[PDB]
Structures are given as structure tokens and as C-alpha cells.
Design a protein around this ligand. Structure first.
Ligand SMILES: CC(=O)Nc1cccc(-c2ccc3c(c2)[C@H](NC(=O)OC(C)C)C[C@H](C)N3C(C)=O)c1
Length: 109
């Protein structure tokens, strides 16, 4: 639906908003494997995702439907939980940001 995609665009705006920045910030941009010294990141995560890539896709009208947008947002969180140890700080942040997402996605018309 154009209405579902519009609902998604709203969710995206909310994910990027400054009020979530204390836990959204690790997800704003792509994981820089070099800069973080993570030599195995790209071996383990075959399909990186981040919110700036989601934003670009949205702006370019690449999502044909809401399901595609959700897939990308969940992919971002799934990569986080797959790559990192379960007691990593970034995992708790992921879960907090995912809750912001999933609540709003469940209310899509
Ligand atoms: C916008 C901006 O400059 N952004 C930025 C800056 C520095 C690091 C990261 C950044 C990016 C991604 C991630 C991490 C950091 C995590 N390491 C870490 O200190 O995280 C918490 C303890 C905070 C590692 C992990 C690979 N990760 C994710 C999301 O799976 C992002």
C-alpha cells in the first residue's frame, strides 16, 4: 500500500529522531569494520544494514512494500545479535531500538 509505506516512513523518522539517540547511535551508519578492528565482521555478516542505508532506500523508492522495509530493519537488529556477544552493551541498545520499531510496525494499518 502507499498507506503502509507512508506508515513505514513515519517509523523511520521516529527511529532517526533525537530522542532515541542514546541507544540508536550505533545503528545510524554502516558498521566500520576497519575502524573498530573487527577483521571477521564481514565474514560473519553477509548482509550489513543500518538506518542510513534504510533511509537512502526509502528516499529512492526502493521498498515495494512494508514487508521489504521491515525485513531491512530486522536484518539490522539480527546482524547485531548474531555478530556480538550476548552481554555486549550494543545488544541492549539494539533491543531498546527494536522495541521502538516493533511497536509501531504492529500498528500499521
Ligand atoms: C554515528 C557514529 O559515529 N556511530 C558509531 C561510532 C562508533 C562506533 C559505532 C558502532 C557501530 C556498530 C557497532 C558498535 C559500534 C559496537 N561497539 C560498541 O562500542 O558499541 C557499543 C558499546 C556502543 C560493535 C558492533 C559491531 N556494532 C553493532 C551495531 O553491532 C558507531
Amino acid at each position: 500500500l502507499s498507506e503502509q509505506l507512508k506508515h513505514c516512513n513515519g517509523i523511520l523518522k521516529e527511529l532517526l529522531s533525537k530522542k532515541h539517540a542514546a541507544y540508536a547511535w550505533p545503528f545510524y551508519k554502516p558498521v566500520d569494520a576497519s575502524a573498530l578492528g573487527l577483521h571477521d565482521y564481514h565474514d560473519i555478516i553477509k548482509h550489513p544494514m543500518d538506518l542510513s542505508t534504510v533511509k537512502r532506500k526509502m528516499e529512492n523508492r526502493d521498498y515495494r512494500d512494508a514487508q521489504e522495509f521491515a525485513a531491512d530493519v530486522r536484518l539490522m537488529f539480527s546482524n547485531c545479535y548474531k555478530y556480538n556477544p550476548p552481554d555486549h552493551d550494543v545488544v541492549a541498545m539494539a533491543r531498546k531500538l527494536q522495541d521502538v520499531f516493533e511497536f509501531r510496525y504492529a500498528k500499521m494499518p
